Each structure stands twice: as structure tokens, then as C-alpha cells.
Amino acid sequence: KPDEQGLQQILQLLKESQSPDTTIQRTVQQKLEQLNQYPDFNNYLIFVLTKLKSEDEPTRSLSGLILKNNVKAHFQNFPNGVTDFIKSECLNNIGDSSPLIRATVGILITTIASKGELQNWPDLLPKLCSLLDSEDYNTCEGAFGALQKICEDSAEILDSDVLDRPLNIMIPKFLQFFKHSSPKIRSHAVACVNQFIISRTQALMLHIDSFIENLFALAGDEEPEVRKNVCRALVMLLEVRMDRLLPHMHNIVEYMLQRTQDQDENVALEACEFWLTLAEQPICKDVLVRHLPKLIPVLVNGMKYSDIDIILLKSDWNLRKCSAAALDVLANVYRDELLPHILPLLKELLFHHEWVVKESGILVLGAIAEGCMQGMIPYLPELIPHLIQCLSDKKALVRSITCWTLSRYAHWVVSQPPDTYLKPLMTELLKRILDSNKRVQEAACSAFATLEEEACTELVPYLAYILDTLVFAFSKYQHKNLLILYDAIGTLADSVGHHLNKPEYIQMLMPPLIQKWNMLKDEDKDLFPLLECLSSVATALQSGFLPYCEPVYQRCVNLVQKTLAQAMLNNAQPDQYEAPDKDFMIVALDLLSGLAEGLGGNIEQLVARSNILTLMYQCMQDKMPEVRQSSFALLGDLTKACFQHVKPCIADFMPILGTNLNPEFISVCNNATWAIGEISIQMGIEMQPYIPMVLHQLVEIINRPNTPKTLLENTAITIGRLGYVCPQEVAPMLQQFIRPWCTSLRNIRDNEEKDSAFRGICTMISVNPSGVIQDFIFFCDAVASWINPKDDLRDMFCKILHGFKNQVGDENWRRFSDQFPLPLKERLAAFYGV
């Protein structure tokens, strides 16, 4: 209806929008974004597209596409008459003779359904399914092309009851068109039907057999698009209806082997996704047996690079990537049983003079490692030094994936004595950490970190060279590589422990780290691995970290507080206040815990002048249990380091621990139970009020069956410590816990924790011996677990044992000790005077 004048100036505007020079283009678009705010404009756009057939097809289409963008944004304020007019024009004129016009109309229909929503245009689905039978191929083709994108956008919408589920006609209506003469039609049909498989929508599950039959009929179509979509369909079926597909499986996999070799990359990629998805299934192991000899070479050949990847480098998902993942899974499934089909390719690939072939070989060697390790062992004496040598190859990609492969054989490398394989590997690998190509830097540093997790103490002779190359890496690593260098340094620190605590190493390492720390910002993204790095470094250096702990402490306090403020704003009103990643706060808390434990009372000048106790109190009831775990650990370490700052808040903390003393959160409950013990020892007799609110819970916990060893040990130790500082309150309870207490602590080292716990059990025996007299054999067993007790604790054991011997009498003690095992009897006898 809108027509005549103004249309000349709109045609002028379109001509201007098609300007050759950018200057007019990027000065005309302002006029367009001023005109969108007048909804009548859209009538002229759809009119130019649909009806002004005297103007050229590009201009008409461009009008349509401008109208597309006007729907992509601020479609909210479109008038109902305008929307109905565009709906009507597009949906009537779907099969225009020009394919460009046809596709413009298709994307208009798509966008008008994608923005907005389907139930605001509900006649669309029936109306264009009725056009689907049309005798004009173009109208049928365009209707299907729109349908496909509607399905791709809105699968879980049509599955839901929000539109009375029109799928129930669409699915069979589609299924009829698998038969159709045109390959494009068949492609659209199966592409529509594919979207609903994983949703396992009922409308398709109830025709699964018709669907599978039409797939088998299409299997022989030498059109690539059809085979692509059929591969996607068969991939999805492996996940959902494995049961219905199983009887046919051998034919399927023969087809899919011929399809993975197919001369098109996309077809091949889907056919390989097939193998990846199948190898995950539990039935697989017996399925592929008669095809593995034909499958494995196809995957190996796929693991070569394409020439296109060669030229690009010197994608996120490739045929190579998928083939290698499939081979890794097949390795983990068949273990050693895979080797006879793959080793003969290896001993050819690995020595080839075409470097890409050699590369595919090293990659295959790495990919099978996890599953095939045991059967690979007798060849590693040849392979590992060859891989070392390949770290010298002129082509960088070889060096990179060789680093990774060696990393995946680290466990065997460290089992052999250091001079054989480990020292050569480490020398060459440190050398290539300083390689000139960033790919090699990344791969070498990652492989080296992976190695350092397993070399452990064996690294200490090399620390000088290690730290030299590492601290030098700070100057060359620009972006991504620097983060992995933090990972490597943290792994080195965790791997060697206190053997790093020497001032020359500190002088090498701390200046660049503290530089990066000071110049990194609260809102930055690099400092997460650096926090983990410094947690490792400080936990290893302990007291040697003292000159550097100021900025990290204040920064971490800031992180915890900022996280808590963001979380508050989020819990009050989410729309403007997105929640923070509490991982930052968790690593900050763990790092402060390590600082306290490693530096001791030297942390007082930082605990005093900071709100760390307020923030910690703010953490201990956070609904994420890892936060609570970290916070209780930090509570205990502050208790140990400088309790004078903590003593005023004990009345606030102790009830919270009384609430969270709960073993269904094992990891949390451990640290909480332990903090109670450290706190009781620092408080002393002042603990009398807080004993009953925790004692019943501890007694329940230690008697819990099938409970992990660490929690049980810490529970017993804390019970003993509370009994040490408050014996009257705990003493009536020994009847109920002495048996598992000794069953646990008989296994633990003679550290100060055990000393505190046994001082506690002795102090409690001095108030109530009966609760031990009930079970005294287990106390004898536990005391026998002591190798080197303190002299006064040894006197206390003597006084208990003799006092109970004189209570029971000589002949009764004889019978009571007759069935001790010999080490028990004899240690107890010699060490305490029988």
C-alpha cells in the first residue's frame, strides 16, 4: 500500500549504500540508523524487495537485508500491521525465480521467527508445510530451506508443549521426502529431522524404524551433502538408540570406513566423529574387532596434517584432531591388544624422511600412550632416545609434538635411573624451552611441567640449570607462554619442596615474579595461575619467603573482599551484578593458609592491620563448600601462627564450626575438625564453654563406618586435644570413642600432633580410667605404635600401664597379655617395664 514519492529517495539511498568508496558508505549508514526508528520505513524495504521488479536484483535484495538487520535489533516496537504485511509478503513470495531473492526472503523468514518467537506467528509452520507438497520446485526448496533453519534455531522449543508440539505432523511429513528426486530436498529433509534426535523427542522415537530404513536407503547416494547429513544422523544415533542400531552395525561401520576415506574433508570429519562417539560406548570392544585392521590405518593417515595446515602454520577441530582423539580412546579401550595393528606403521613412520609423515608418527606414538603403556615398555629403550634426538629436528612442529609425546611417557622415564633417559631428556627439553618458535616453547614447557610432577625429588641436582632457564624465560615469553611458565615454576616448587629454600635461588626467582605481581591488576586474567604458582612457591620456601609476603598478602585480602562484595550484590539483585568466579577467592584463601603455616608468627604485622578475620568469618558460611574448606584451613593456620589476633573472635567462630562439623562434606569437615584442635590447644582451659557443643558431633563422627583415613585421624587428634585442655568435660566419653581412636592413631607418625593427642588421652585417663579399662588392649596397641616418645609422655605411659597392672593383679595381667603378638608384647615389656 505505501507507494509513489519517497521511493525515489529510498532508491537513491540504496544506490548510495552500494557506493564503491568507503567514505560514502560509512556516511550513509547514519541516515539508515536514523530511519529505522520510523517503522513505516520497513514497509518500503519489504516492498522494494518483493514488488519493485523493475529495479535490479542486488538493490532489491539489499533492501531485504537491511530489513533483516532492522529485525535483528529493536523488533520489539514493530507495529502489528507492519509485521503482518512483511509476514504475508515473504511467505507468499518464497519461491521467486531469482535464487538471491529467494535466499533474502528465506533469511527474512528465519529472522522473523528467530527474533520474536514462533507462537507469535503460529500459522507459519502449517502454512509452509502445506507449501511443501508444491509442484513448483522453487517454492518447495525455499520452504524446506526455511524449515531447516527454524529447526536448527528452536529445537527444544518445538519439543516443549508451548506450541501444542506441531512436530507430530512435521516428522512424518519430512520422512516422506527422504524419497524425493532432488538431492537438495533430501538434504533439507534429513537436516531438519536430525535436530531432534538428541532431544529424543517422542514424535521421532515412535518412528525410529522408518527413519533408520530411510537412512539405509540413502546410504548409497553419491551426493556429498546427503552423505554428510546421514553421517551426522548416524553419529547421533550411536548416543541415543544404540539398541535399535546394533543388529545392523557391521554394515554401518563398513559404510563409515568407506566414508572416512571419502575425498571431502567435511564428510570425512563427520565419519570420524562416528568412531569417536562409538569408542565411548560399552558395547564397542566386541563390535570393531573384525574391522580394527582396516580402521586403524585410516585414523593414522588422518592424523597427518593437511597441506593446508602446513601452510597455515608455517583451526579448533580437524580430521587430525578427531582421529587422534579416537585413537586415544581406542587405546584406552583395547590396551595392549591394539599393538600388532599399529606398531608396524610406527616403525615405518618414525624414520621417514618426509617430515610430515614423521610428525604423524610421533603423534601416533603419543596418542596411544595412556592405554598401551605396558605393551609399549619393551620398545621404549629404542624410542625414547630417538624422540630425544627428534627434539633437534629442524622442523618446529616435530619438536613440539615430540615434547608432548615424551611428556606422555614420563612415568616410564622416571622409573629408569637418571643417567639413562631422564638427564638427557631434561637437558634437551630445557634447551627447547628457550626455542625460537612459540609453538615449541608452549609444547616444551607444558611437557616439562608434566614431567616435573613425576620426577619429584630427582630434580634437586639440576635446580641451578632448571631455575636459570626458567627465570630467563620471563624475558622472552610474551603472552600465552608466560602462563605455562607459572605452571612450570609452581610444579617445580611443589615437586622439590623445602629443598628450594636457599637464598641464591630466591634471588634468581623472586624479582621477576614480584614484578609481574605488582604490575598485574585485580581485574586481570593472568593472575590465576600466578596465584597457584605463588601458593606453591611460598609453601616450599616457608620462612625464606618473608621479605616478599607484604604485597601478596594485601592483594589477596583485596581479592577475598572484592569477591564477597560482588557475591553480595549478586545475591541482592542479579540483573546488573553478575556473580564472581569464587575460584579466585578459593586460591587466595589457600595461599594465605600456606603463608601462615610457612612463616609462623612473622605474619602478625599483616594479620593485625587487615580485616582478614572479618572476611574469613564472611567466608565460613558461603554456600560453596570449597570456600568453607579453604577458610577453615586458613583459620587453623592463623591459630597456629599468631593466635593473639584470633582470640577475640573465637566466640563468633566456634558456633560456626559447630554447625559445619558435618561429614557429608568430607573435604570441608576434615579441615573444620582439625581447626577445632589447633584452637583448643591455643586457648587452653578457656575452652570449657565450647566443649559440649562439639563433643557429641565428634563422637558421632569418629564412630561413622566406612570413613576416610584423614578425617578419622584428625577427628581422633582433635578429640584428644580437647581432652588435654578440658579433661573434665570430655572424660565421661572415653567409653564411646577409645576403640576407633586407637584403631586410627596406631598408624600415624610420631609427630607433635600424635604427642598432643596422647597427652590428651593420658590426661583424660587420670580423671576417668574406667572408659579405658573397658578396652585397654587397644590402648596398649596404640602406645606400642610409638617409636620415640617424649620422656614425660613415656613416663605417663609407664604410670598408666603400671597403675592398671597393679589394679588387675599379676596373674590377671598374665592372662591379659598372653595373646599379645610378639612385637607388641616385647616392645611394651622392654619400653615400659612390663
Binding site: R320, K321, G366, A367, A443, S446, A449, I484
Partner: peptide, 7 residues
């Protein structure tokens, strides 16, 4: 951890 394996 998510160390840069090649697949």
C-alpha cells in the same frame, strides 16, 4: 590443569 595436548 588443562595442559596443551594436541587434541
Amino acid at each position: 590443569r588443562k595442559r596443551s595436548r594436541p587434541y
